[PDB]
């Protein structure tokens, strides 16, 4: 059944753009560095504009999948795959298309040593990440998710700063592969029952409570590694710290979102009965991760480790929201996911600004920076506040909505989750003050440069996006509520 | 000002001394004024409606 | 001090004494007053006073929303 | 004297984004990334500034508001 | 292309929906799920319209709100019990 | 005198590397056994039962039986 | 400010984070006594039972204690 | 002491519920004087003095009612 779309801008062209960029960049000699830079940046920017147009034609009254286009695999047509988005995946496509040009711009100065391999790796990552978010099939979702492991492994290992990147890349690859292997088993068990992997059909098929429980456990084994939930989160600090800056931006801003996206797209709607049974279990794991990892963050001494550990606590608050199973909880969970991809990405950009100049991540060396880099200090303070979920910032909207949705279900989990307001404030301000405030230490650092024109421009869309969501989240919530409402109602008829 | 053995004290500005004395004098008068208008009331001697 | 003279900042750093600070201060005055004009117009458009004041008040000169929410069983 | 004697900073301390000014009479060279980025930034505001304010309001909230208004009208005038 | 105007939906529940075995007509199952979501959103807007009434009664009547808005508060509080997807089921 | 890179301190870097390599120091002592038992096992079970009990107390407030959980 | 001390001895743990004359548990005992003053004072307030020596009768408001004016059934 | 100000007069005067007591009929002139005179303390001394006397009269009445009740608590004890 050729369910092709009538719109002019569709998902296939968006998936094809960065692929064309990579193919063209395959054949350009490494002496034409200017041309390589320009072509990569332009391909990413056109992809961003294309995704913005997809936003423009979005229809916010339907709970159906929009811009659905079919892609055929066999002329037998037994196995035929569909692409489409709804209010739950649209903004994540947008976020991917926006973060990739940032990743290219961050490594602009070193592009004479990075080479076309760096741009091609990021453009290939873009294609797979956009595709993952646009899949209406369990099997294609699985296959595209693992494809990102190859370029992410390459990015971490080749362009990481020090040789701990070896261990980091190994751990990342092995943990993620294990998780994806448990998902494969569940996909093949689903396919044994239903004879299909088409998501829309699965949303209309009934599962037994026993097999719902079991298949939910099989999905959890992958998603909890992706989120990450305790105690399988220890790969994250190594991988996100040893990666290059743009690698950290992609890892924390997009790849982390895949486990929570998988909870919203597959487990929660497809197995409603099992989801209710495991709700105290998810509540306990998330609450422990929020309290415990926030306290570990307090005692970290590496700049990138503090930011990496903060990401774990923010993502477990997201899981409390999505498993609250109401408009505020799921609505807040998606907004926090988007906000985190901007705030943590900006924070990894601040640390990279410091590291590119002085080549150290230890907090003890820094301090006093407000007297030499006031521009960086002001930008760093703003994203420090956004990381504390200050009202008026994008992160406060998602945070409070999740707490609202949790309070209406279980007042205890909402209380433990609200403890991150105290803990998250403690490590964010302690980090900012030890780096920016105080006096300089000329025996460690004596030569300083504030942000240049490229770094300031890089920070601009992050400030605008954070403010825009923090003061007027209605432009996002309006386009989501119809898909959110039907996700909550899935499996009940009263 | 006046010097007494090393340590010198400068005289205050004239309007500073005038305002200080004047504001407290305004305060002392307002206190005596009020105490005679509603002093028996707070002592409990009479009541406001007495008359 | 010595190195802070080579450091750019939005607030001007230490002991900022711009030579033309008076014309810049007066230009800054005008910008705020020009910014205030749309704000005041929008404020006057948005205010809601369900109660007539006991005496005439300065906001009856520009605001036309006095005694309007009497029909409350119609508000949506 | 702080209000009647002008300041001494003929030019502000430091340089904006730490770039030395170009030679007198000369214009700064734009780096290769500026033009594509400033065109993307301009097109971003134009698409979102116009498109979001020009797309129709199809929220479930706007449709239900109108629907709920008529049902409360229809149960009030009728008993 | 799309015609201008507010979205249009069927007023009535889909015909073909057996509430005894909801997983027998899937096209109707999906359409019932969408219809219930739309119906629930209508009651949500109902309580919000009713809430605007309580607000302006308090603002208009002041110290006399307990007697003058007794009826509106009852209506709002009844509409909010069992509303949306909150702390009440049906 | 030369460069923007930090002048490394041998003592501060040693403190940094000893932090990264903590897993080589774990020994399975008495204190660790108490700490892992209390905060790795006992406390999560306490939070789990508190959350379940919170749901159950709601069930008997609604005149409903105790909802089953995995 | 003047000259920041550069370490010359191997840095120990709990250095990122590193009340003089009075000991730890002795301060807890003195604060506990201070809070025990509020406890004893509060108990004395119960023992006093001022509510039982009220020198006037509870206010009575007209119109059934303003039953309608307080949101009751009219 | 009998109730004078009807329910409608108090509601139209927008009297705080805690001041809708037996002396409400005198509060209405007082508050109308207070608003018209910007609540300065040297104004409306006449309406204020009249209303305060009524409120003093009310509290003394309830004080005397308890003065009685207290004289019967001991009667029960003196005969127990």
Curated annotation (Swiss-Prot), chain B:
Topology of this chain in the membrane: Peripheral membrane protein
Cellular component GO terms, alphabetical: mitochondrial inner membrane; respiratory chain complex I
Superkingdom as given in the UniProt entry: Eukaryota
Intracellular or extracellular location(s): Mitochondrion inner membrane
Main location: mitochondrion
This protein's UniProt keywords: Electron transport, Membrane, Mitochondrion, Mitochondrion inner membrane, Respiratory chain, Transport
Function: Accessory subunit of the mitochondrial membrane respiratory chain NADH dehydrogenase (Complex I), that is believed not to be involved in catalysis. Complex I functions in the transfer of electrons from NADH to the respiratory chain. The immediate electron acceptor for the enzyme is believed to be ubiquinone.
Quaternary data: Complex I is composed of at least 49 different subunits.
Entry's family note: Belongs to the complex I NDUFB2 subunit family.
Protein name: NADH dehydrogenase [ubiquinone] 1 beta subcomplex subunit 2
Full-protein residues shown: 9 to 59 of 69
UniProtKB/Swiss-Prot annotation, chain E:
GO biological process: photorespiration
UniProt membrane topology term: Peripheral membrane protein
UniProt keyword annotations, A-Z: Electron transport, Membrane, Mitochondrion, Mitochondrion inner membrane, Respiratory chain, Transport
Any one Gene Ontology cellular component term annotated for this protein: mitochondrion
First-listed, main subcellular location of the protein, grouped into a coarse class: mitochondrion
UniProt region (Disordered), positions on chain: 1-24
Subcellular location: Mitochondrion inner membrane
Domain of life: Eukaryota
Oligomeric and partner information: Complex I is composed of at least 49 different subunits.
Similarity section: Belongs to the complex I NDUFB10 subunit family.
Function: Accessory subunit of the mitochondrial membrane respiratory chain NADH dehydrogenase (Complex I), that is believed not to be involved in catalysis. Complex I functions in the transfer of electrons from NADH to the respiratory chain. The immediate electron acceptor for the enzyme is believed to be ubiquinone.
This protein's name: NADH dehydrogenase [ubiquinone] 1 beta subcomplex subunit 10-B
Region of the whole protein represented: 2 to 91 of 106
From Swiss-Prot, chain G:
Domain of life: Eukaryota
Keyword Transmembrane belongs to the record: yes
This protein's GO CC annotations: mitochondrial inner membrane
Membrane topology, record value: Single-pass membrane protein
Alphabetized UniProt keyword annotations: Electron transport, Membrane, Mitochondrion, Mitochondrion inner membrane, Respiratory chain, Transit peptide, Transmembrane, Transmembrane helix, Transport
Places the protein is found: Mitochondrion inner membrane
Keyword Cell inner membrane: no
Transmembrane segments: 27-47
Family stated for the protein in its record: Belongs to the complex I NDUFB8 subunit family.
Subunit structure comment from the entry: Complex I is composed of at least 49 different subunits.
Role description: Accessory subunit of the mitochondrial membrane respiratory chain NADH dehydrogenase (Complex I), that is believed not to be involved in catalysis. Complex I functions in the transfer of electrons from NADH to the respiratory chain. The immediate electron acceptor for the enzyme is believed to be ubiquinone.
UniProt-recorded name of the protein: NADH dehydrogenase [ubiquinone] 1 beta subcomplex subunit 8, mitochondrial
Organism, as annotated: Arabidopsis thaliana (Mouse-ear cress)
Lineage of origin: Eukaryota, Viridiplantae, Streptophyta, Embryophyta, Tracheophyta
Curated annotation (Swiss-Prot), chain H:
Record's keyword annotation contains Nucleotide-binding: no
ATP-binding among keywords: no
Places the protein is found: Mitochondrion; Mitochondrion inner membrane; Mitochondrion intermembrane space
A Gene Ontology biological process term: photorespiration
Keywords for the protein's UniProt record, in alphabetical order: Disulfide bond, Electron transport, Membrane, Mitochondrion, Mitochondrion inner membrane, Repeat, Respiratory chain, Transport
Residue stretches spanning the membrane: none
Highest taxon of source: Eukaryota
Subunit description: Complex I is composed of at least 49 different subunits.
Family recorded in the similarity comment: Belongs to the complex I NDUFB7 subunit family.
Descriptive protein name: NADH dehydrogenase [ubiquinone] 1 beta subcomplex subunit 7
Protein source organism: Arabidopsis thaliana (Mouse-ear cress)
Residues of the full protein shown: 8 to 87 of 103
